[PDB]
């Protein structure tokens with residue numbers, strides 16, 4: 001595994017995430033390190049998990065996914081090392097961070113990271129991120145056996161985060177805002193491609209209510225892509241993996257209709 | 270071409286630009302990927318183009334310049350693959366993005382990217398950036414023949430953006446603000462080294478009017494570098510490739526004199 | 539030295555720091571380039587120096603530490619190339635930038651960078667950062683002898699920045715805020731592990747006065763890690779290399795108690 005993909009909440013504005021790569025480089029000088037992001041919101045293990053959901057599929061099987069948003073650092077919350085179905089390794093706090101990454105490619109084997117010989121010593125209690133997660137990630141990239149990191153554990157011993165699921169209701173489908181595509185202000189839902197094919201049939205616009213905004217009701221064209229309506233006009237579309245989203249063509253949807261994650265969305269014919 | 274240089278408007282604050290590198294890595298595991306920037310303003314194809322202008326000269330001939338600011342994604346606007354005079358390859362939306370990069374090293378051969386075998390399938394209509402641009406960029410880095418991407422097209426079929434040119438007027442030279450050096454607030458013009466050598470002769474300060482600010486007139490020393498005046502004092506200078514600029518020594522010029530791109534600048538003796 | 543670690547104040551939001559990597563890649567195509575940060579505050583050579591302090595220890599001996607915050611560019615302030623005790627090379631403005639990096643691993647040999655053959659020609663007076671620092675860094679990574687860069691100089695000819703030291707006073711220890719961990723708002727002091735072991739004995743909370751805030755006095759638990767108090771409650775702790783710090787558990791300390799660097803901190807039993 002010569003590729004190490006690296007995510008955290010330490011930011012990219014100071015030297016911290018780079019000290020981590022320094023440790024990794026020394027351990028695994030044959031390795032390539034690519035940053036996922038270091039801009040996860042601080043302590044926000046669910047934001048990080050969401051960022052990581054599509055990382056398994058996008059990255060080659062020879063990747064180590066090294067991840068650390070670890071406000072539980074220096075406590076009884078351990079680090080885990082996981083082999084997934086794709087053959088990738090993934091290292092991080094057992095705090096639910098890897099939950100959605102594992103939804104895409106389940107755990108096949110899991111170990112708690114307990115061995116001193118895969119840690120950067122002496123381990124600093126406020127930076128398990130660098131001393132255990134990053135170092136272990138580098139040891140594995142460097143050819144270390146997974147079983148050498150510490151004791152096997154059962155996959156149910158991996159902490160999982162609840163994720164709401166969209167459903168059929170009254171006369172359409174009810175889901176919620178999962179996240180915002182912050183670079184553009186597009187809104188992303190948890191509504192899968194399959195649920196809405198009944199109301200996709202007729203070429204007519206759909207009804208969308210967002211209840212968090214004094215109960216806003218929009219009528220909206222279901223589009224393949226942004227360019228299909230006039231600039232600044234709203235659309236509905238399937239985002240880049242298979243969820244319903246809302247945006248304005250070459251404008252910012254949420255600046256116009258201020259939704260947050262959690263907000264309910266119903267679509268109906 | 271084992272070097273891939275990567276620019277977009279998707280931002281570096283979430284996992285998106287990294288999923289792109291993931292796709293590329295899988296295709297071209299021998300490749301090095303360096304980010305240009307992922308902070309281009311959203312949909313701002315002219316800002317991206319400006320960022321890319323000096324990239325050809327600075328990068329080695331074995332570079333693939335992979336670029337994607339593509340609000341036309343999933344439409345009749347195609348992706349193009351270009352070999353330039355330097356021998357570099359460049360892949361991106363035919364939307365004017367590569368215009369200024371091509372000013373520095375013209376197109377020698379150009380193809381539209383139409384072949385399924387250089388795309389990451391199935392292609393998502395809202396992310397041609399990842400599925401066509403990035404994948405094609407990776408295929409080429411991986412040794413793929415340029416002609417294998419799709420149909421040759423003539424260089425005039427590459428969309429070009431208008432760029433104003435500075436000129437001789439009344440009693441000096443009239444140009445405009447091209448961009449701001451945002452990290453420092455220095456102002457960059459389109460006034461070439463050659464135009465002002467007549468007023469460079471005498472060692473005297475120059476007159477600079479910026480008409481966008483109720484008609485501001487400054488008298489200003491023409492300097493080699495910032496350090497040549499006292500701290501916080503204004504200067505004129507030739508920036509790092511050969512355009513006239515304005516700044517304060519170890520301060521922020523535009524915070525003091527609020528110009529935007531487009532604003533006219535005349536310099537005279 | 540096949541690893542080049544790169545820091546500056548040019549930002550990561552435009553193409554500038556990437557043009558630098560372009561130059562380096564062309565010179566040293568065998569090299570790996572990792573960014574330290576490009577977000578140092580503009581012209582802030584002391585902020586950059588602080589960021590660089592722990593870089594020697596974290597990075598392998600085969601690193602070139604290439605660094606450039608150089609508002610003295612195009613003046614009599616020269617660039618220097620240094621071999622340290624660890625065997626690493628370090629290239630940058632002789633402006634105090636490398637001061638704290640050198641505290642961690644002193645200079646063993648030093649040269650001013652004067653030779654044209656390790657510069658990217660022609661050298662632009664406003665970007666010694668790219669044309670001399672980065673290019674030289676790349677030449678050295680590429681196998682160039684250190685002595686080939688220019689004239690040896692004595693280590694006392696390297697400009698050093700003053701750093702306050704914490705001390706014993708009245709009935710405890712008096713130090714100061716060195717920097718803030720900006721991603722989290724934790725406060726970092728210059729108080730070493732060794733000074734406070736006398737008041738560490740008894741398991742009791744400590745007194746901390748911060749005089750810059752109308753004279754704030756907190757009573758505070760000395761902890762190994764954040765998780766040891768309730769969420770949102772304040773702690774004292776030893777940060778990740780051996781200095782006393784203050785934070786809130788999974789909250790932002792400085793947003794609550796607005797300290798800056800320079801502010802005095804006394805701890806006492």
Ligand SMILES: C[S@@+](CC[C@H](N)C(=O)[O-])C[C@H]1O[C@@H](n2cnc3c(N)ncnc32)[C@H](O)[C@@H]1O
Nearest residue numbers: 010016043069070071722764778785786787788
């Ligand atoms: C200290 S930080 C990151 C590196 C840091 N800049 C350093 O040099 O020590 C390590 C982890 O601690 C957590 N963390 C940081 N500050 C914290 C605080 N005040 N409370 C709880 N967790 C914190 C973050 O989630 C982060 O993943």
Ligand SMILES: C[S@@+](CC[C@H](N)C(=O)[O-])C[C@H]1O[C@@H](n2cnc3c(N)ncnc32)[C@H](O)[C@@H]1O
Nearest residue numbers: 184226240247248249250279285312338339340
């Ligand atoms: C969707 S984005 C980038 C990746 C995205 N974060 C994702 O995961 O799908 C792809 C391209 O779409 C364009 N784009 C994004 N949101 C848009 C909107 N509301 N209107 C028009 N173009 C948009 C951007 O210029 C960008 O280059």
Ligand SMILES: C[S@@+](CC[C@H](N)C(=O)[O-])C[C@H]1O[C@@H](n2cnc3c(N)ncnc32)[C@H](O)[C@@H]1O
Nearest residue numbers: 453495509516517518519548554581607608609
């Ligand atoms: C010009 S800048 C960085 C590259 C720049 N974006 C470019 O393309 O030319 C080079 C160095 O100049 C210094 N610098 C930039 N603007 C300045 C100003 N107005 N006064 C003093 N120093 C400046 C910065 O500290 C920086 O390290």
Ligand SMILES: [Cl-]
Nearest residue numbers: 073127128129
């Ligand atoms: Cl950590």
Ligand SMILES: [Cl-]
Nearest residue numbers: 342396397398
């Ligand atoms: Cl796209």
Ligand SMILES: [Cl-]
Nearest residue numbers: 611665666667
């Ligand atoms: Cl410079």
